[PDB]
Amino acid sequence: MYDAIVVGGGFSGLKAARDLTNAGKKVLLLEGGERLGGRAYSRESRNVPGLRVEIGGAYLHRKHHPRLAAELDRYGIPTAAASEFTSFRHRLGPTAVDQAFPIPGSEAVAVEAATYTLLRDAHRIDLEKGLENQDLEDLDIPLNEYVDKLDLPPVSRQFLLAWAWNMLGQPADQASALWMLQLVAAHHYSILGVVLSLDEVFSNGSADLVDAMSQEIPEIRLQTVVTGIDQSGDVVNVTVKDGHAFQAHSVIVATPMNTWRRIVFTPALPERRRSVIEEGHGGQGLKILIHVRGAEAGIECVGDGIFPTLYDYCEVSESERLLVAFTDSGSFDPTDIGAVKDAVLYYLPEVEVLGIDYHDWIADPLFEGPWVAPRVGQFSRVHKELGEPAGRIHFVGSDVSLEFPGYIEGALETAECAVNAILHS
């Protein structure tokens, strides 16, 4: 038996297992898959032999992400500025200007006023209380309705919606306006900063930091899928698909929220959590790496396309690159290459699509989704509680971070909190 079993070897599990180990606890980490890192996944390109790509979560910003910065510094992990955009190819209508902030002067007054409203609304959110504890239900409505109320002129309207579609991984009618405001709050109450935090990347992929952390974790079992967590006895019993159980005084659930429903908890989890757990969050973000020819470096495109965003990802050769597109898997089928071409050509009619690469997070039984975003009405009902302990079982991860949900920083933050709680007892 162990002091702690950690379930899941994403960044959160890795942090928690390492820091409990360095505190002198006896820890076991169980990861269901054949790799560590979770929704941070670097691997070989499907399109380009020998090419290392981030298929999951690539970007960071030192200022917004101090725990991640500290990890990078601890292990001397090299980062680089994300590809600068030097060419803008928006689809926002004839008055938009082709630069990173494409709003024309004729919209300036409207943007001013909307800026006040958006930040006013976001300033209602105290990031420590939980979205269900602040009388925020009036904001917890479909984004398209909230945006219709701002009544914005065309360029800024579509610019906001496009970026919200990219960032939330939901179309406007499925996204919560409240969750959009939570992301604003999380970035030091900044609309701009939501996009500005795409600031740096791992020079060698997020695996660099995965490997550094794992090297400090003495006991890790891969291909070990947890199926039951039973705290009915004096010591927690952890049951596993094809093997003998493991026991520990404490268990950390560091798996994705949308998989918790596949674990049997004994006794059953607090009733208020159960239906959100059963339903899952609604995020459907779909990131597609597009292998292309005929694109010059430094392109960014934002617009009204089925791809709200399409931007430079990496050089492959002198004539070839990867672009990245964001959309959502409810609205777009990435295996339909014809559809991919149409979506690309919309912005960039000179560009030839060679290939696509993505991971199906939704179909992956170890995830059942990409990054977190709640369905409308979910998080103003129950939110903070999803990341709070039930007896000796802690719940951690990006999915349940109050402070930086959906980012690596949030995986670190939630782990930090579970670790401290365990150290006190």
Next chain:
Amino acid sequence: MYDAIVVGGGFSGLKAARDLTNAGKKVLLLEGGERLGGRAYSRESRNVPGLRVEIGGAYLHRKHHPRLAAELDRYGIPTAAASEFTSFRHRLGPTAVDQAFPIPGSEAVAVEAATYTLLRDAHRIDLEKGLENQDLEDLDIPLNEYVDKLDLPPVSRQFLLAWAWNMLGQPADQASALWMLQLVAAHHYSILGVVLSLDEVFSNGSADLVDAMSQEIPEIRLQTVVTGIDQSGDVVNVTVKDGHAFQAHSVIVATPMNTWRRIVFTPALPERRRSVIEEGHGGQGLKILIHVRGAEAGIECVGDGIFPTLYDYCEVSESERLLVAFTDSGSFDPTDIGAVKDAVLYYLPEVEVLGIDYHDWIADPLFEGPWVAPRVGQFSRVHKELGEPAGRIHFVGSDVSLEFPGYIEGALETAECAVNAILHS
């Protein structure tokens, strides 16, 4: 004896005398000077023979100024777009960009946050209540201190200060942050709109509208300076520098606030008004028309110069123009041509100064100031009351408008209110 004596033949007096006349009242208008229009003054250039210039208040915006628009439409008075700026020559430091909104991307987040603060603060102001009636005293502090608290990076810092110096006619340490916020409030709670309302000009000078209104006023006496207003008897007695008194049931004071102290009121005005009346407002705006050679059309300059603003005013010839500079008469002496050259050359080192033209509003006994701006601490003590009747004596004018102080629209608005009040009784 008359139903009403109107004192002062600026726009406010003109409106009030005309509309009381058209209502069937018997009205007399007394103007101390040799001309009508007041602080709206078109005349011949001192520098350029035969050239008609606006030496006072030139600009209007139909959307912000519906009473003025209605006057223009009533009389079919032609307006034109103000000179478009096509060339930007700012002094805001090496990161500023040379366009109308000179803020660089590296300041975007700071501007976002300041935008929220400024509009939050301005949204505390209800334009109908008076600045003294809303618990606003905490904002009624020196602008430089308020701005230091926003802690803005250099370009937006200086851009804000420069425009505030231009618009208020006071240096930052004499201006009230509260009054800056009042101008924001007045423009539909818009910082941008403060500058955007410089939108159109009278094609033939503001005299066009002065003349149209005056033609409807059957009795006007020029060179008739009022010295006393005595409502001790049943009928008001109006006493005059070199002449016999005039009598009326009602008197409208439509003279500038800083001259009211030169009139003897009987009985004395309500005590709360008296000290602001004695002291006068603090506006020192100084508009200088600069005759130049070597400037191309369409220049705007905003910066840290003794002229915060310097911009195109009119074509004189193919090689010559008028520019306009705004500063304040406490900080700058316009008759020092050497100083003018230095101030111009700062922004535009290729430009030769031929001549300057201005009106000394401060020295003019019929004004004792340019447009209104309060001293720090004045208007959170007494404001709305300055424009309220004392018995049968009404007080009107731009100076005391709650809604558009310092603009023609505010002259019209205050007159409208006195007129209605008189018509009811």
